[PDB]
Amino acid sequence: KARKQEIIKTTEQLIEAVNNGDFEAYAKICDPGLTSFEPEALGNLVEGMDFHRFYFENLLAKNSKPIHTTILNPHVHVIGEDAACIAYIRLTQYIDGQGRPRTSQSEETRVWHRPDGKWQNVHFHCSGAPVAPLQ
Amino acid sequence: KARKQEIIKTTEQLIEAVNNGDFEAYAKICDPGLTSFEPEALGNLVEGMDFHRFYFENLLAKNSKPIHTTILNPHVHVIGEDAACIAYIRLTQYIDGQGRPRTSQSEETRVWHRPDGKWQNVHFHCSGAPVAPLQ
Amino acid sequence: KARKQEIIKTTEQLIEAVNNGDFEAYAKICDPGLTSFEPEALGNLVEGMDFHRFYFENLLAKNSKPIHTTILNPHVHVIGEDAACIAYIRLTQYIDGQGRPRTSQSEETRVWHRPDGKWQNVHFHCSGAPVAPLQ
Amino acid sequence: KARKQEIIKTTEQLIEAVNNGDFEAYAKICDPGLTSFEPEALGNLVEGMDFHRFYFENLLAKNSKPIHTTILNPHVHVIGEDAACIAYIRLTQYIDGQGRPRTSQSEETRVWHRPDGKWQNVHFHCSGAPVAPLQ
Amino acid sequence: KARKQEIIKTTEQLIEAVNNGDFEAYAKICDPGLTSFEPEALGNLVEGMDFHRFYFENLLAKNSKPIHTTILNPHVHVIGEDAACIAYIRLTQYIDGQGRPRTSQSEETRVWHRPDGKWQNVHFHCSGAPVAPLQ
Amino acid sequence: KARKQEIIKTTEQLIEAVNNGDFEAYAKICDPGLTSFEPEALGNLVEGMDFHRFYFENLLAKNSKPIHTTILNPHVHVIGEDAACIAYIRLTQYIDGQGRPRTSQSEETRVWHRPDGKWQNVHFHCSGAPVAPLQ
Amino acid sequence: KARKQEIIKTTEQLIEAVNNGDFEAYAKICDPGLTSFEPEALGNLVEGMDFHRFYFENLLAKNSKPIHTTILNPHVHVIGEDAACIAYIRLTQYIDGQGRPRTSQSEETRVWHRPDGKWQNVHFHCSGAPVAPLQ
Amino acid sequence: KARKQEIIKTTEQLIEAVNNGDFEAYAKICDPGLTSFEPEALGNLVEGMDFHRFYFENLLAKNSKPIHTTILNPHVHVIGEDAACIAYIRLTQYIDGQGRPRTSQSEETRVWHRPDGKWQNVHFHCSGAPVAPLQ
Amino acid sequence: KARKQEIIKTTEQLIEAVNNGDFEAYAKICDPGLTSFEPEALGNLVEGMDFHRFYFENLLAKNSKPIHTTILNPHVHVIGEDAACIAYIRLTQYIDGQGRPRTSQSEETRVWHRPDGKWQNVHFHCSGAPVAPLQ
Amino acid sequence: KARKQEIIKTTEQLIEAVNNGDFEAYAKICDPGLTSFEPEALGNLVEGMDFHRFYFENLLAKNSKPIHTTILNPHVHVIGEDAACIAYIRLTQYIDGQGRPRTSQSEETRVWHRPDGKWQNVHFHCSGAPVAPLQ
Amino acid sequence: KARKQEIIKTTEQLIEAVNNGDFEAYAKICDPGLTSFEPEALGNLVEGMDFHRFYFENLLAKNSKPIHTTILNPHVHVIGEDAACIAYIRLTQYIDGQGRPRTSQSEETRVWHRPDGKWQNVHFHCSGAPVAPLQ
Amino acid sequence: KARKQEIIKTTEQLIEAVNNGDFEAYAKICDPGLTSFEPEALGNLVEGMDFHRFYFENLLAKNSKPIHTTILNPHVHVIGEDAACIAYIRLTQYIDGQGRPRTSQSEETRVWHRPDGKWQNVHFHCSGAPVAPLQ
């Protein structure tokens, strides 16, 4: 029951890092063997860090607008000493190009591995809208 | 090599059972704590086996019309000893109500746990089209 | 903590009783001075029991077609010692007129009162889709 | 009978404070454990104050264009000594972007609780249009 | 304040009489010099009692299906000692030709005069949907 | 019999003042406890004078386009000595925002009371087009 | 004056013949050099005016199933002292083919020559919607 | 003969005064007691020339383009020494804001009066185009 | 030189075989390890004979209507002694379900291998419209 | 053996040159008078490397912009000893002129031959899109 | 077979002349009676060479930069000993006024005659696809 | 001079024969080695009579609706002794789907050869609208 919290704490740290656009923190946690599905990939399974490395240098470079992100009803499933999974729903708020505020919803999955006592992410699934809000 | 093979073996068997409509085989493999994302849930994190039992007794009792399911390029990780993850793309061939062939795509994720003796599925995630064709 | 339980138990009983069309049972939980917003009222605050009595002779009596009701993540506030407020989301499954499955979502609110050693309902707010299934 | 009045007076104060785009007065009433269903939440249940704070910083107070708010036929229950619920309809008048008058209708619910000599809100349900009018 | 109750009681009696198709009861209260607006006149100010006699032999002779009538928030003015005005909303519940229920809304006005110790109706104005339900 | 004329004289002045855009005249004739049905109320029953003050300040006061109004075949009932009911039809000819002439129809009802020796309106009904000009 | 009533009575007599619905009576009233037109006649303007015959057939074919009639707000001009012009708006109520009651409207222009026992007409233009505006 | 000619001549004079906007002559030909059915009104019996005046003062101030008209199939009959009927189809020729060739059409009636030796029109029936078209 | 001929004959024979649905011949020429791009694959590389087997077993077998083909400007290379490539443009004629005439266009590439003295196709690449006829 | 790594070096070298304006690499690998399918010619079978020479030397050697190329699950067949066939899917990452990142999907094919030991590509086929993306 | 090639080169030089001052030589080589019809002519007889250059002028108006063109699968007949006709398809690669690469396709015909031992073009005909909407 | 006449006469005979769908006659005039361009070929150099044979069974066989064909501004070149060229304008009239005649224009160019003592067509280049009428 204690581990669940630190798993959720780690997930929050990861989401915060990607939002702030620090490639260093993302690289530290993400296992180079990471595999992910995103709408950015047009529905093709993608592997490796290089694919995401592009966005940290040209997309989030403009991440200056006011946004807010909420995490709803996280569910953590424990399957072993160094294995765990987490699922949750994600709500984000932002301001569109018309000056109005907008909201979007997306559900996500992540699988965590602990080699050498340190958690790392080895999978990622995003459904619905793209991670970056549409404006 | 060996373990990566049989994870695919079980996944193939599970996909076969759901297509055939056999409730017992699906019940055996699936873990009691199973969660799921899928379009049938309108974006909610459904849990348990009660929700899916509705479909088996009513809709999938018939598999008359032709259908062909294919799995392309599976990727499997092994976590620790008794945990693994599998990601793959699925192609479904079916005939529509107008009697013409039609193909649909969907990418899916799964997390497998083996407590002591039998592999079991604890989480699921289907993005895009539903688990069955739109006939 | 136990108080938060019997409320959810009662709410589950009331929803079950409505789905079975047994008006007699529904007349005990509900306080005579009931009020409610629901789509059937066209956005007007209805009061009393006579309004709902109509449905319990023609429509809900014929409520025999297969259906499944799910309650997701209820939340309860305990006010004072003899009152409470509960909110939740509701998922319904039904077979439409085309022989296909469907799902509908609607959130709800309820206020419970405890005079005379029993729990009773004194308000009800339903958004989104109608309470009854759309077969 | 007097207690049935100050609840209405308090509700009017809260609506005015929201309309003026002031946050300090808003916090002094709303309970820290507030929950609410609003269209801005896309049908989910949102807890806490942090979610609403975003709106008060970018949208409400920026223009304050001419508008009028009307409350019709409030209905109030008195539960115990420190609990009450209120239901009402709300008509709003505003000028659209085309320079023409418009109207919009919505119904709302609230639950009040008074620990330590102060009425405080713990639940809020809004159907139809959201709290903010569609200008 | 005493007069208001009897006026409302009279109005309810009148609505009951028309529903049951008793022309004699309708005539006993309504003043012979009655005018009325309603969709049945296509927007023409009708006058006299002959026009409405047509409905009490061919329209209500056919329709006998179950129906329920509700009256909401009646308001009454007193502008003398033998004259009064009443305004209210009305909701009707009826079953259409598909074997399913539906609701209709209309708002109405009436003017009452009291010659010979008896209240009499002199005007009527049904807005929105017509007086009768559309099955 | 002459009273049937002065009522029409007052009604004509009331409509003229409404069209012109001055608020003082409308206030004097209209009783403070005035009710009203009109499309701008979205089918609800409004009370008081403030609901219209918004219209006068923004739209009517700024009316600067040619339009025409006519009254066809009024009917007047005299009840008591200080009360009477008037019904009539209203054809409005207006130059639209496109600088083109167009016609629309609407029927109305008004109830008149004369305390202290001045006639005043206590109730108002309108159908079809809105009370305000359709420019 | 009195002669205004006489023409009114004769108009009812013409109506009486119309319910009988015999074309010979129609020919009797019409002057052999009468005029009439309508676009539904493709603008044809002849004494026969078969377009009148067209909706004479449709309307009067209903008479096997009972009908009722009504007229409103007649207006009369006496030409010199030897001819009379009469106009009005006519309401008719009928049972349709589906068994539902109906109402129909028809404006009318008629002119009658003084000579007693030989009254005849030179013109008529039903116009408006002689049969049905929009079904 | 001479009679029938001058009515037609007058008929044209009336038409020219319309297009030229010579209201004073139009007022001279038309009896102040004129009455008319025409689509400009929604089936009502307008009285006087004020309703038509709108189609002269504020319309012709900007509605002025080279325009022509053709009179088709006149047919007249005489009644007594001061009464007669004239019926005619009218074409109006001008190009609107579309490249398609254009020719509008109207068909009309007049009933004629000669008090004191000067002819005048007392009743007027129409259909199709208004007194003046859009430009 | 003749080698560039026989290859073209083989490709023409293959096209005829698939047109007539002779599964055996198609299997004989097609290598067991065939790859393929085509519109039906939604841009996914599909290997083996099972994927195409669906068309023969379901559609082509039942389909008995005729078909005709046009092949334009083939270019063939020569590599080694058991390899070759062919590129060309294609135009095809057939009959639909309604029987009305239908002609299709496609542009296709193929690669051939000749081990064991028998020419066999190991790769294929279509474009544009679907390979299968649209009946 | 070691063919998959062979294509890695060979295909990488070809792709790198393609993304650059140099023609030496393109000329050396390609085969003179070779057909190739690219949407640049609308399936006109661009013959000879000279077609690509014109654009690469003159225009396409523009200023580079941040772009990224990806290759997914390539498949290789080895024909005889001096030939091979390769298929794969190419995802292109680029930033459009609006300043927003974008991705595109396009599948390809290539046939390789070893003339006198050194490898040479004697065919090329691009589907879905051309070699280069559009900004 | 040689005579089939000389025609091609004569045409190849002639086509290249369009891009140089040799266009006058192209004019000189052709019969002064040279004539052609073009898709956009719709009755405008042209000298053949002029209209084709006019297309080239349009491209150079946008381009005014160096050009490359290609000719594919030429077809040449042999008629008599002093006549011949050629058919071919032409592609042009150019840089647009926006600086981006572009391509165009054309279909051409030419008639050749050799009096006095000099090949003279006596009839030309081009073909493109400039459909009117939006190019 | 006389040689010019027969060229036009034969072309008329071929065109008329084309209109009548008499494929056998068309097969005689046209040389077996016919080359042609046309919209149906999508800008491709078709060869042989097989492609054209299709139209003479489905489309040209049903050519029974009224049609009119005209020849304008014919011009003929005489090359050598057994060759000649013909160019002209073409106008076709036909009844469209709306039942209104339509006019279409199309320009051609042909080359005739005279072996065996008879004229035959060895080229054809149609532009603009298709050969067949667009009914």
* Long-range contact set of residues G5-14: C-beta below 8 Å, sequence gap at least 24: G7/G76, G7/G84, G7/G86, G7/G112, G8/G74, G8/G76, G8/G86, G10/G112, G10/G119, G11/G71, G11/G74, G11/G86, G11/G88, G11/G110, G14/G110
User: Taking the CA of residue J116 as centre, how many other CA atoms within 13 Å lie in the half-sphere pointing to its CB?
Assistant: 1
Q: Determine the residue type at K19.
A: N
**Token representation of residue E41:** 């006149």
Q: Residue F1 class from Cβ within 10 Å (0-12 exposed, 13-18 middle, 19+ buried)?
A: exposed
Structure determined via: cryo-EM
**Token representation of residue K116:** 């006095």
Query: Which residue of E lies nearest to C54 if distances are taken between CA atoms?
Result: E68
Q: Is C79 on the interface with D (CB under 8 A)?
A: yes
Cα–Cα distance between A134 and A130 in angstroms, integer? 8
Which helix (H) or strand (E) segment holds residue A103: the answer is: strand A101-113
CB contact under 8 A, F44 and D91: yes
Q: Is J123 on the interface with I (CB under 8 A)?
A: yes
Fold observed for domain F3-126 = Nuclear Transport Factor 2; Chain: A, (3.10.450)
Check chain I for breaks (C–N over 2.5 Å) and list the residue before each, or none. Answer: none
Q: How far is CA H115 from CA D16, G121, H2, H29, in A?
A: 72, 21, 18, 12
Instruction: For residue D9, give every residue at least 6 positions away whose Cβ sits within 8 Å of its Cβ, in sequence order, or none.
Output: none
- Chain D residues in contact with C80 by the CB 8 A cut-off are 79-83, 113
CB contact under 8 A, I72 and L44: yes
Measure F49 CA to nearest chain D CA, in Å.
12
CB contact under 8 A, A59 and J93: no
In this complex, how many residue pairs, one in chain A and one in chain J, have their CB atoms less than 8 Å apart? 26
CB contact under 8 A, A37 and B113: no
Cα–Cα distance between A98 and D134 in angstroms, integer? 14
Q: How many residues does chain H have?
A: 135
**Token representation of residue B117:** 């003796």
First vs last Cα of chain A: how many Å apart?
40
Q: Determine the residue type at H77.
A: H
Best CA proximity match to L46, nearest among K64, J26, A38, K73: K73
In this complex, how many residue pairs, one in chain A and one in chain B, have their CB atoms less than 8 Å apart? 89
Measure K68 CA to nearest chain J CA, in Å.
7
Cα–Cα distance between J84 and J86 in angstroms, integer? 7
Measure J4 CA to nearest chain I CA, in Å.
17
**Token representation of residue J34:** 């070779």
Instruction: For residue B121, give every residue at least 6 positions away whose Cβ sits within 8 Å of its Cβ, in sequence order, or none.
Output: B14, B29, B30, B31, B34, B110, B111, B112, B113
CB contact under 8 A, A68 and D54: yes
DSSP state of L39: G
Q: Which chains touch A (3 or more CB pairs under 8 A)?
A: B, D, J
Measure D131 CA to nearest chain F CA, in Å.
18
Instruction: For residue B4, give every residue at least 6 positions away whose Cβ sits within 8 Å of its Cβ, in sequence order, or none.
Output: B76, B78
Listed in order, strand segments (DSSP E) in H80-133 are: 83-93, 104-113, 120-125
- Which residues is E67 bridged to in the sheet? E94
Residue indicated by tokens 């264009």: D65
> Which of residues 19 through 78 in chain G touch H, CB cutoff 8 A?
31, 33-39, 43, 45-47, 73, 75, 77
CB contact under 8 A, H51 and F70: yes
- Chain B residues in contact with I54 by the CB 8 A cut-off are 66, 68, 93, 101
- Which residues is A89 bridged to in the sheet? A72, A107
Instruction: For residue L75, give every residue at least 6 positions away whose Cβ sits within 8 Å of its Cβ, in sequence order, or none.
Output: K35, K45, L86, L87, L88
Query: Which residue of I lies nearest to B71 if distances are taken between CA atoms?
Result: I46
Cα-based torsion angle of the residue sequence J61, J62, J68, J72 in order, rounded to the nearest 10 degrees: -40
Q: Residue G113 class from Cβ within 10 Å (0-12 exposed, 13-18 middle, 19+ buried)?
A: middle
Fold observed for domain C2-126 = Nuclear Transport Factor 2; Chain: A, (3.10.450)
Query: Which residue of B lies nearest to I48 if distances are taken between CA atoms?
Result: B70
Best CA proximity match to L106, nearest among L124, L119, L82, L118: L124
H132 neighbors H18 (Cβ within 8 angstroms): yes
**Token representation of residue G81:** 């002292």
Beta pairing class for H120-125 and H30-37: parallel
Fold observed for domain B2-128 = Nuclear Transport Factor 2; Chain: A, (3.10.450)
Q: What is the CATH number of domain G2-123?
A: 3.10.450.50
Domain L2-125 coded CATH 3.10.450.50: yes
Cα–Cα distance between J47 and K88 in angstroms, integer? 14
Q: Residue C99 class from Cβ within 10 Å (0-12 exposed, 13-18 middle, 19+ buried)?
A: exposed
Cα-based torsion angle of the residue sequence J93, J96, J99, J104 in order, rounded to the nearest 10 degrees: -40
Beta pairing class for D30-37 and D120-126: parallel
Q: Which chains touch L (3 or more CB pairs under 8 A)?
A: I, K
Residue indicated by tokens 């007392």: H122
Measure I127 CA to nearest chain B CA, in Å.
17
Cα–Cα distance between H87 and G46 in angstroms, integer? 9
Listed in order, strand segments (DSSP E) in G1-135 are: 30-35, 67-79, 83-95, 101-113, 121-123
Instruction: For residue I134, give every residue at least 6 positions away whose Cβ sits within 8 Å of its Cβ, in sequence order, or none.
Output: I96, I102, I104
Cα–Cα distance between E69 and E91 in angstroms, integer? 6
DSSP state of A133: P
In 10 A of CB K87, how many CB atoms?
Answer: 23
Who among E79, E105, E125 is closest to F125 (CB)?
A: E125
Handedness of CA K59, K60, K65, K69 (dihedral sign): positive
**Token representation of residue D124:** 């809020």
Cα–Cα distance between I28 and E107 in angstroms, integer? 80
Instruction: For residue B14, give every residue at least 6 positions away whose Cβ sits within 8 Å of its Cβ, in sequence order, or none.
Output: B25, B26, B29, B121
Helix intervals (H) in C20-127:
23-29, 50-53, 55-58
Cα–Cα distance between D104 and E11 in angstroms, integer? 31
Q: Concatenated DSSP letters for K2-46?
A: HHHHHHHHHHHHHHHHTTSTTHHHHHHHS-TT-BB--TTTSS--B
Q: Which chains touch G (3 or more CB pairs under 8 A)?
A: E, H
Measure F87 CA to nearest chain E CA, in Å.
8
Q: What is the CATH number of domain J4-127?
A: 3.10.450.50
Q: Is F103 on the interface with E (CB under 8 A)?
A: no
> 3-state class of A53 per DSSP?
helix
Measure B29 CA to nearest chain A CA, in Å.
16
